[PDB]
Amino acid sequence: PRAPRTYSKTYSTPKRPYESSRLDAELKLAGEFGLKNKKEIYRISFQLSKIRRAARDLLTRDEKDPKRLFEGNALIRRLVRVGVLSEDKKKLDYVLALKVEDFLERRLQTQVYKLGLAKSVHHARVLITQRHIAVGKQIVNIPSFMVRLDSEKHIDFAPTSPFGGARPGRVARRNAARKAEASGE
Amino acid sequence: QVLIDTNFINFSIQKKVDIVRGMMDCLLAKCNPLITDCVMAELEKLGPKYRIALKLARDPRIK
Amino acid sequence: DIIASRLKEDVAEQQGRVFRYFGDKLLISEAKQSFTRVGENNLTCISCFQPVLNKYTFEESSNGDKNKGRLFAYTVSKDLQLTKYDITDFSKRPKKLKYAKGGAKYIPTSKHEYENTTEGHYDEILTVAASPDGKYVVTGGRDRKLIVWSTESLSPVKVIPTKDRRGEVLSLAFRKNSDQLYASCADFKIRTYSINQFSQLEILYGHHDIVEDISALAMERCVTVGARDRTAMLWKIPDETRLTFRGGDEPQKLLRRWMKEPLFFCEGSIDVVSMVDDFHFITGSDNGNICLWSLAKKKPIFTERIAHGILPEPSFNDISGETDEELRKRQLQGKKLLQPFWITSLYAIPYSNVFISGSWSGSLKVWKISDNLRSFELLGELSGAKGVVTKIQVVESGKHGKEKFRILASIAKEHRLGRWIANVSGARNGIYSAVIDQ
Amino acid sequence: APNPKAFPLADAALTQQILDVVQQAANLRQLKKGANEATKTLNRGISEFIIMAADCEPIEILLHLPLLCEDKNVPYVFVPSRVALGRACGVSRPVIAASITTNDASAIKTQIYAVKDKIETLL
Amino acid sequence: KNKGRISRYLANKCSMASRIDNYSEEPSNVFGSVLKKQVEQRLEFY
Ligand SMILES: [Zn+2]
């Protein structure tokens, strides 16, 4: 005796999911950025398509029309908040010209590897899901965080980790126990 | 950058799709249409029945 | 009327806007100046403790009665030397009372840096604070520990390792007559501390680049300047909020406003802040432009030019190395090289409308705020410093009518952060006593 | 009639922008400091672009570089304060010449390219 | 090792001297004197 609960499929699906071009595309992207799922790639590209299509129609609309102007500044402000569009090309032509590889760059773990706290994308992945890195206060563990500028200047370690902080973890403290054991037995 | 041919222009006018807006419709981004001089001459040597399609395909948006 | 006015001062001193505007009656002209040279170098800090008869209850601020309300001081240098000084003899100079040092004998044998818990100082003390009850003297440095000494026996008694690989202790400000403490570190962070229980209350993130300088009052609103990113922020603990304030000023529009009737240097950095009451604060940038700000708006209330002077320009031979004189000075190239001075030290007198800006620029320049609260002016100079003036405090004594004020400052030969000292003329390491009256 | 050989110096604006990018490079290890290392970096060919100061004592120590920079078509700019350059470098002493090295694996790669484009415009 | 330190140092100084007297038209032997007196000062160091 309530309302229907809210839900919606948050990704779309390509029209030719088996083709050499699209397949090698997904191969090269997923290998260069350490992914595992066609779901991840297709979902990012779907959200991009939504953004780009709405911006397309609102660029076809006429100039000096507050609908076009206000909606365009809304989407440009969203994108400059995210960081994927530059500050100086703030135009509808450049939200159109944006594409997938920029978002695959501005994904979080990508920034971890570029900044070089770990020397592999896969090291970055296992580090984030083993809970060692935080921007500011909360320690994130979803490697699809979509980090903006206001945090990308603040990606940091965990000061409760035994990496950048406190007492040894599980294996190092067991090895400490058993070197003490080898010391005292 | 796209290359337009005689069959493309023909079926474009037979289905009433304006060129650049139809291109933005297809590609979802910014794109420029180009035709070559050989293609222009091909339409020309097709000739007098398709002169309206010729006057269309010659438009100073098409570099 | 006199006793009612004095009691309303002593009660409403904790709250309200600016009340004390005592620049006029001061005899700045004969402000006596004295410098005491210390043998070892790299004096980061001196900081005083004033034992005040609290207007709530009249016991004393001292922990015992052996102090009798005598004015305390502590001087620390990057040779890791902490020496407690007495500053209560006003005709005379401060006194080197108690000495303690740190060497290379406290570096952790175990590099885990969690238990960095050797009692003494091994790595580069850079900041210190006397507790305004005199209860302890607290020390932070590049060691990334907060070592608290009992002051009289100069004993390291408790330690707070700041559990960081990079979080070197940079700037410190004691909240006025509380038991909270304000540390600010260049891992883009500000820490709120407590020594009454030896605890660490809160962590605060939010600048882009490393934060530089901090100020606060008896209220829980700390303003911090972070430098290259050109931002200050006010951080209010009790509601847990942070209000951001920026500049980004443009010398282009500056020179065009001058043409609509001079030397304009863009803000490369910020150095200092001082919250002179709990709605207005000064911020010192790097190109000399000193900016006073009121709380509600995002822009400053005022931005002033070259205040510590501009720097002079070098000579023909030591720029060019060519024999021909005219080619030498066309390599000096004219004015396309010039530089304005910097603002390293700036002391705001508590709950007042004055502030003292001094550096290696050879002259402390003192400023007063007009009581419409919309500008400050450059009043005066003091000249007894010969060295780069790092850290200033002030001790006032006497009766309420005619007070004797003391600018007491740590002075080194090298800058606060790096060396960078552009070969200063007239420099010595020591303690700077500047006694003004009324 | 001929220029001083530190040609060309930049706007205060381009100076501010360059100092921020070199500071972030100092953070991310891709800044190397010092004229000697700049020379070796140009010989290795792994140098992306060059900042120079125009105030050291004297300026021919820094003036040896334009030959190499024009030799491998490398952009090189001038800033008038070695002490501001050192403050940007985050080091204990003024620096007279700094190299931003090559990595395509960067976080500030786009900003490096942007300022490099600015240099090529002002050349 | 030690004479290696001395020679490394004077090699660096010589590099500065070579560049200045290369690009500069006519020399600065006052700075030459600075460099040589610094050489003798690092010599009285070691
Ligand atoms: Zn052809």
Swiss-Prot record, chain A:
Phosphoprotein found in the keyword field: yes
Compartments where located: Cytoplasm; Nucleus, Nucleolus
Primary localization class, coarse: cytoplasm
GO CC entries: 90S preribosome; cytoplasm; cytosol; cytosolic small ribosomal subunit; nucleolus; nucleoplasm; small-subunit processome
Cross-link Glycyl lysine isopeptide (Lys-Gly) (interchain with G-Cter in ubiquitin) mapped to chain: K179
Gene3D superfamilies reported in the protein's UniProt record: RNA-binding S4 domain
Note: Present with 106000 molecules/cell in log phase SD medium. There are 2 genes for uS4 in yeast.
This protein's name: Small ribosomal subunit protein uS4A
Source species of the chain: Saccharomyces cerevisiae (strain ATCC 204508 / S288c) (Baker's yeast)
Gene: RPS9A
Swiss-Prot record, chain B:
GO cellular component, one term: small-subunit processome
GO biological process terms, semicolon-separated: endonucleolytic cleavage in 5'-ETS of tricistronic rRNA transcript (SSU-rRNA, 5.8S rRNA, LSU-rRNA); endonucleolytic cleavage in ITS1 to separate SSU-rRNA from 5.8S rRNA and LSU-rRNA from tricistronic rRNA transcript (SSU-rRNA, 5.8S rRNA, LSU-rRNA); endonucleolytic cleavage to generate mature 5'-end of SSU-rRNA from (SSU-rRNA, 5.8S rRNA, LSU-rRNA); maturation of SSU-rRNA
Compartments where found: Nucleus, Nucleolus
Molecular function GO terms recorded: RNA endonuclease activity
Domain of life: Eukaryota
Main location: nucleus
Start and end residues of each PINc domain: 1-63
Keywords, ordered alphabetically: Nucleus, Ribosome biogenesis, rRNA processing
Family classification: Belongs to the UTP23/FCF1 family. FCF1 subfamily.
Function according to Swiss-Prot or TrEMBL: Essential protein involved in pre-rRNA processing and 40S ribosomal subunit assembly. Required for the early cleavage steps of 35S rRNA at the A(0), A(1), and A(2) sites.
Assembly behavior: Interacts with FAF1.
Protein name: rRNA-processing protein FCF1
The organism of origin for this protein: Saccharomyces cerevisiae (strain ATCC 204508 / S288c) (Baker's yeast)
Swiss-Prot record, chain C:
Family classification: Belongs to the WD repeat RRP9 family.
UniProt function note: Involved in nucleolar processing of pre-18S ribosomal RNA. Required for efficient pre-rRNA cleavage at sites A0, A1 and A2, and biosynthesis of 18S rRNA.
Record's protein name: Ribosomal RNA-processing protein 9
Extent of the WD repeats: 120-159, 164-203, 206-245, 265-303, 339-377, 384-430
Note: Present with 5130 molecules/cell in log phase SD medium.
MF terms in GO: snoRNA binding; U3 snoRNA binding
UniProt-listed GO biological process terms: endonucleolytic cleavage in 5'-ETS of tricistronic rRNA transcript (SSU-rRNA, 5.8S rRNA, LSU-rRNA); endonucleolytic cleavage in ITS1 to separate SSU-rRNA from 5.8S rRNA and LSU-rRNA from tricistronic rRNA transcript (SSU-rRNA, 5.8S rRNA, LSU-rRNA); endonucleolytic cleavage to generate mature 5'-end of SSU-rRNA from (SSU-rRNA, 5.8S rRNA, LSU-rRNA); maturation of SSU-rRNA
Included stretch of the parent chain: 115 to 570 of 573
Major location category of this protein: nucleus
Cellular component GO terms held in the UniProt record: 90S preribosome; box C/D methylation guide snoRNP complex; nucleolus; nucleoplasm; small-subunit processome
Organism of provenance: Saccharomyces cerevisiae (strain ATCC 204508 / S288c)
Record localization: Nucleus, Nucleolus
Assembly and binders: Interacts with UTP25. Component of the ribosomal small subunit (SSU) processome composed of at least 40 protein subunits and snoRNA U3.
Entry comment, domain topic: The WD domains are required for nucleolar localization and U3 small nucleolar RNAs binding.
Encoding gene per record: RRP9
Swiss-Prot record, chain D:
Primary localisation category: nucleus
Gene Ontology cellular component list: box C/D methylation guide snoRNP complex; nucleolus; nucleoplasm; nucleus; precatalytic spliceosome; small-subunit processome; spliceosomal complex; U4 snRNP
One Pfam family in the UniProt entry: Ribosomal_L7Ae
GO MF entries: RNA binding; U3 snoRNA binding; U4 snRNA binding
Effect of E57A: Impairs binding to U4 snRNA, but not U3 snoRNA. Causes pre-mRNA splicing and pre-rRNA processing defects
TM stretches of this protein: none
Subcellular location: Nucleus, Nucleolus
Keyword Oxidoreductase in annotation: no
Keyword line: mRNA processing, mRNA splicing, Nucleus, Ribonucleoprotein, Ribosome biogenesis, RNA-binding, rRNA processing, Spliceosome
Family per record: Belongs to the eukaryotic ribosomal protein eL8 family.
PANTHER family tied to this protein: RIBOSOMAL PROTEIN L7AE FAMILY MEMBER
Functional description taken from the UniProt entry: Common component of the spliceosome and rRNA processing machinery. In association with the spliceosomal U4/U6.U5 tri-snRNP particle, required for splicing of pre-mRNA. In association with box C/D snoRNPs, required for processing of pre-ribosomal RNA (rRNA) and site-specific 2'-O-methylation of substrate RNAs. Essential for the accumulation and stability of U4 snRNA, U6 snRNA, and box C/D snoRNAs.
Protein name (database record): 13 kDa ribonucleoprotein-associated protein
Source species: Saccharomyces cerevisiae (strain ATCC 204508 / S288c)
Organism ancestry: Eukaryota, Fungi, Dikarya, Ascomycota, Saccharomycotina
